[PDB]
Amino acid sequence: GMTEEQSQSFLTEFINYIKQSKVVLLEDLASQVGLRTQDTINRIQDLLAEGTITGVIDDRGKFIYITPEELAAVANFIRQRGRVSIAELAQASNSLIAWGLSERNCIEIVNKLIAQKQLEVVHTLDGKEYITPAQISKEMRDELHVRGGRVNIVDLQQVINVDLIHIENRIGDIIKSEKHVQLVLGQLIDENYLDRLAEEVNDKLQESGQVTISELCKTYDLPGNFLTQALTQRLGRIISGHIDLDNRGVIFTEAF
Ligand SMILES: [Cl-]
């Protein structure tokens, strides 16, 4: 049958067509090997599946060769944007690949980069944007500083529009990088919030005269050991108090 001289010549004839233009008209290439257009496509489908050649096939029966330099351009474009819509990526496509790609074709490329471990991204829950885990860290920090310095991780999930695990995975990154930021009972808490909390404790101290840690823990819903170390760290710089030890750690005004 066909396959003896076909399989040997097909790949070299394909390459000869790729040298002339990275865009291959599969109907036209099917004339140069004298084959059925559908049989021609199927062998290219198979060659892409085997991992033999890098490219995509549009809805109108053209194949597009993509160089490793052009893949690298696609991966770096998504890195630099951090968050980007599949629609933006299709518009950008001609500047990155010298060919205007369908949204589908762009997805096929991104999924290739993911599998070859040349890019690290995640799908938004609407399926409409790609976001980098570096950009998730950034958008967690922006929404933390925005929402006052204390925010639940579950609220950041809703906001950033990505599955929970992709927020939960960046918590190593936000505590190594930001020495001012800490994880407490499913929330991220900012140096700026603890200073603001210390101010409103000192205002309630200069009114009550005295106040107990167990009363502040019920007031702000924070754990004892954490809240004690956060307030005792701010004693004298922000709180005009004196610590003493009762049944519980207790704070009262010195200048009284
Ligand atoms: Cl991941």
UniProtKB/Swiss-Prot annotation:
Disulfide bonds: none annotated. Induction: Up-regulated by thapsigargin. Down-regulated in the failing hearts of patients with dilated cardiomyopathy. Ubiquitinated, leading to its degradation by the proteasome. Interaction with CDK5RAP3 protects both proteins against ubiquitination and degradation via the proteasome. The chain holds residues 27 to 182 of 794 of the full protein. Changing residue 203 to A: Abolished interaction with CDK5RAP3. The gene is UFL1. This is E3 UFM1-protein ligase 1. Changing residue 217 to A: Does not affect UFM1 ligase activity. Residues 101-256 are annotated as: Required for E3 UFM1-protein ligase activity. Belongs to the UFL1 family. Residues 101-256 are annotated as: Mediates interaction with DDRGK1. E3 protein ligase that mediates ufmylation, the covalent attachment of the ubiquitin-like modifier UFM1 to lysine residues on target proteins, and which plays a key role in various processes, such as ribosome recycling, response to DNA damage, interferon response or reticulophagy (also called ER-phagy). Catalyzes ufmylation of many protein, such as CD274/PD-L1, CDK5RAP3, CYB5R3, DDRGK1, EIF6, histone H4, MRE11, P4HB, PDCD1/PD-1, TRIP4, RPN1, RPS20/uS10, RPL10/uL16, RPL26/uL24, SYVN1/HRD1 and TP53/p53. Changing residue 106 to A: Does not affect UFM1 ligase activity. Catalytic component of the UFM1 ribosome E3 ligase (UREL) complex, composed of UFL1, DDRGK1 and CDK5RAP3. Interacts with E2-like enzyme UFC1. Interacts with RELA. Interacts with NBN; promoting recruitment to double-strand breaks following DNA damage. Interacts (when phosphorylated) with YWHAG/14-3-3-gamma; sequestering UFL1 and preventing its association with PDCD1/PD-1 substrate. It comes from the Eukaryota. It is found in: Endoplasmic reticulum membrane; Cytoplasm, Cytosol; Nucleus; Chromosome. It comes from Homo sapiens. Ubiquitously expressed, with a high expression in liver (at protein level). Low expression in several invasive hepatocellular carcinomas, such Hep-G2, Hep 3B2.1-7, HLE and PLC.
